[PDB]
Design an enzyme around this catalytic site. Structure first.
Site, PDB file in Angstrom:
ATOM      1  N   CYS A   1     -12.018  -0.328 -66.916  1.00 22.02           N
ATOM      2  CA  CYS A   1     -10.606  -0.233 -67.290  1.00 22.02           C
ATOM      3  C   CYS A   1     -10.196   1.143 -67.811  1.00 22.02           C
ATOM      4  O   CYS A   1      -9.002   1.364 -68.031  1.00 22.02           O
ATOM      5  CB  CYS A   1     -10.218  -1.287 -68.342  1.00 22.02           C
ATOM      6  SG  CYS A   1      -8.471  -1.313 -68.809  1.00 22.02           S
TER       7      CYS A   1
ATOM      8  N   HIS B   1      -3.627   3.708 -76.335  1.00 25.83           N
ATOM      9  CA  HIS B   1      -3.964   2.740 -75.298  1.00 25.83           C
ATOM     10  C   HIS B   1      -2.959   1.598 -75.285  1.00 25.83           C
ATOM     11  O   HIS B   1      -2.485   1.182 -74.221  1.00 25.83           O
ATOM     12  CB  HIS B   1      -5.382   2.215 -75.514  1.00 25.83           C
ATOM     13  CG  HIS B   1      -5.964   1.533 -74.317  1.00 25.83           C
ATOM     14  ND1 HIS B   1      -5.321   1.489 -73.099  1.00 25.83           N
ATOM     15  CD2 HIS B   1      -7.133   0.872 -74.149  1.00 25.83           C
ATOM     16  CE1 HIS B   1      -6.069   0.829 -72.232  1.00 25.83           C
ATOM     17  NE2 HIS B   1      -7.175   0.444 -72.844  1.00 25.83           N
TER      18      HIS B   1
ATOM     19  N   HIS C   1      -0.370  -3.814 -68.145  1.00 29.64           N
ATOM     20  CA  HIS C   1      -1.651  -3.110 -68.227  1.00 29.64           C
ATOM     21  C   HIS C   1      -2.392  -3.170 -66.900  1.00 29.64           C
ATOM     22  O   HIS C   1      -3.050  -4.182 -66.599  1.00 29.64           O
ATOM     23  CB  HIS C   1      -2.511  -3.705 -69.339  1.00 29.64           C
ATOM     24  CG  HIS C   1      -3.859  -3.068 -69.474  1.00 29.64           C
ATOM     25  ND1 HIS C   1      -4.839  -3.573 -70.299  1.00 29.64           N
ATOM     26  CD2 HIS C   1      -4.385  -1.958 -68.904  1.00 29.64           C
ATOM     27  CE1 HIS C   1      -5.912  -2.808 -70.225  1.00 29.64           C
ATOM     28  NE2 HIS C   1      -5.664  -1.823 -69.384  1.00 29.64           N
TER      29      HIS C   1
END
Lengths: 42, 498, 96
Positions: free
Chosen positions: B161, B293, B331
């Protein structure tokens, strides 16, 4: 030039009879089947 | 060492066909997470009804990129969209793609899914061999190198990720050491198999509301979204357009943790930030904006924010702006870094910071937000000027951080030749592209750099782009002309009058 | 330190790679502890995630541990986590 259409996988393309193995070896759980001997055969 | 600059940029993000639409959605506060059931039935297996989904995954200009109809039908949508996005990104910087052919440019691609190979190869009786060539994850970069004729490294990374920023860091390392004169970094993620969403739900990461509410007291989970983004990196001597300069990029793994594999450790992130900005020789005060993030988790957000506060806000007297692109588009796991980079670069170009959505109250666990040290961008703000930081963390334990210096080149002063009429030439697959280029050039008749960069990308053989058209600018009798260029070379003869 | 339920849902590649990595570190005469906390990195080259496809075929009964134990990226992050390696941990994908 985006006139055409190309294949894209659908939702049904992905996962969403019964086979039983009779192993008479010592470690296997079906070991007791070696006690069912008739005519000298299992 | 040699300077590294982000020259090109392009991508296809949720509810955004290109970067201009993406920015229009970002600034306008449009929510790119949708409740429609396109990929799979809404509410399936208890999954959230929302997800960031691209507009279309079934369009590909096969003839241009040399893919026959059978091969195109058996190619991963990721690869098709990535080829298109890569060509878009290379030409965005004004670099003609044929000018890099045969060079040492490298392709680093960050991907974490190969669902198409699993879908196509399910039936052993009636499968096609060339399916592997178009679906094998290693081919997500080898195909780009094959088409663009790049002799540099061609790798695909997972990085759990944080793959897009990992590829960006690797490309920066390669260009810095003079191995690669350029580099194409890309990240792709497409949601096709609901089983992966079910797995993520089971792990306890997805949000029941399907919203990635970051920096907020009600953070539950993130909303899985699609996205394809490609960025071009070049040494400063080659770049025509410079979005920014990478001062330093690094990486490190959290290592062992008592909590487990999937629990972030903020100390490691703080160490990464401090080491990067100490090696790069950039004082903490210079930072103006931090691209956290922002996955919207209940534990990750406090750790990340406390680490950032300790690393940067320790001594600065001015508040450090913070924000996350995931409050707008969700995301994308592999491509999270590239989306943040695109948001930051577009915000710098347009002079405003894109606001962050779904921020009402600050999470009590973060003292910086309660105080004034860290300020979340809840509405548009002008850009004062300063270095920008982007960090992407993967649930595996990987970390990445990049320090960007914005490109601030004031427009040139008026020159005598400015009023002189100029010539603009365009080339496209269909007359629509040529008309688009000509119209956009007409709307910016006074931008010399834009016109020159457009001209540099108009020299393509008629075989690839069988349409063409010019438009003289600054003339009263000004009107575009277009026509289809015939195939075959033509001798150029001269005649001198008497 | 892998609990039995996690072990079953773990890719055999990772299961063997942990042991092989420990054997390789000790093979060099080094104690795997002296590398704990260092900036040692891990680079793993894999080209197949078959185990993940098998463990995620029945949404009714599939468990979420398979994501951690069968993801391609975890073929290196698991090693970095066990051996406490602070360096880069990637999972390359180029075939052959």
């Amino acid at each position: 030039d985006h006139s055409l259409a190309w294949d894209v996988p659908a939702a049904e393309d992905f996962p969403n009879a019964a086979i039983y193995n009779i192993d008479t070896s010592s470690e296997s759980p079906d070991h007791y089947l070696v006690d069912h001997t008739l005519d000298g055969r299992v | 060492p040699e300077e590294v600059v982000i020259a090109g940029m392009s991508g296809k993000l949720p509810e955004s066909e290109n970067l201009q639409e993406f920015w229009d959605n970002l600034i306008g506060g449009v929510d790119m997470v949708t409740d429609d059931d396109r990929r799979w039935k809404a509410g399936l297996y208890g999954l959230p009804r929302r997800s960031g989904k691209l507009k279309d995954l079934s369009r590909f200009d096969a003839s241009f990129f040399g893919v026959h109809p059978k091969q195109a039908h058996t190619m991963d949508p990721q690869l098709r969209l990535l080829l298109e996005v890569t060509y878009e990104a290379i030409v965005d910087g004004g670099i003609n793609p044929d000018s890099l052919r045969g060079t040492h440019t490298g392709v680093w691609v960050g991907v974490s899914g190969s669902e198409t190979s699993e879908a196509l190869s399910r039936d052993p009786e009636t499968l096609v061999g060339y399916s592997m060539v178009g679906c094998q994850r290693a081919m997500m970069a080898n195909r780009l190198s094959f088409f663009f004729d790049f002799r540099g490294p061609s790798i695909a990374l997972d990085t759990a990720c944080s793959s897009s920023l990992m590829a960006l860091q690797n490309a920066y390392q390669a260009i810095h050491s003079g191995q690669c004169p350029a580099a194409i970094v890309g990240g792709i993620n497409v949601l096709l198999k609901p089983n992966t969403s079910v797995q993520f739900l089971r792990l306890g990461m997805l949000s029941p509301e399907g919203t990635c509410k970051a920096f907020d007291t009600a953070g539950n989970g993130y909303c899985r979204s699609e996205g394809v983004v490609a960025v071009l990196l070049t040494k400063k001597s080659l770049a025509r357009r410079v979005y920014a300069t990478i001062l330093n990029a690094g990486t490190n793994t959290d290592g062992f943790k008592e909590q487990g594999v999937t629990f972030p450790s903020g100390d490691i992130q703080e160490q990464l930030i401090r080491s990067l900005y100490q090696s790069a020789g950039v004082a903490p005060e210079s930072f103006e904006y931090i691209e956290a993030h922002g996955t919207g988790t209940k534990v990750g957000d406090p750790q990340e924010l406390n680490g950032i506060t300790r690393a940067l806000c320790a001594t600065r007297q001015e508040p450090l702006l913070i924000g996350s692109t995931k409050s707008n588009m969700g995301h994308p796991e592999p491509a999270s870094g590239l989306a943040a980079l695109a948001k930051v670069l577009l915000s710098l170009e347009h002079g405003l910071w894109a606001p962050n959505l779904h921020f009402h109250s600050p999470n009590p666990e973060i003292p910086a937000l309660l105080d004034g040290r860290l300020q979340v961008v809840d509405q548009p703000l002008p850009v004062r000027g300063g270095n920008v930081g982007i960090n992407s963390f993967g649930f595996g334990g990987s970390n990445v951080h990049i320090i960007l210096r914005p490109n601030t080149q004031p427009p040139p002063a008026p020159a005598p030749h400015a009023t002189l009429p100029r010539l603009l030439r365009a080339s496209g697959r269909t007359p629509e592209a040529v008309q688009k280029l000509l119209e956009q050039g007409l709307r910016h008749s006074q931008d010399l750099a834009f016109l020159s960069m457009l001209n540099d990308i108009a020299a393509v053989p008629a075989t690839a782009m069988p349409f063409r058209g010019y438009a003289v600018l600054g003339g009263e009798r000004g009107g575009p002309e277009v026509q289809q260029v015939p195939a075959g070379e033509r001798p150029l003869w001269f005649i001198c009058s008497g």
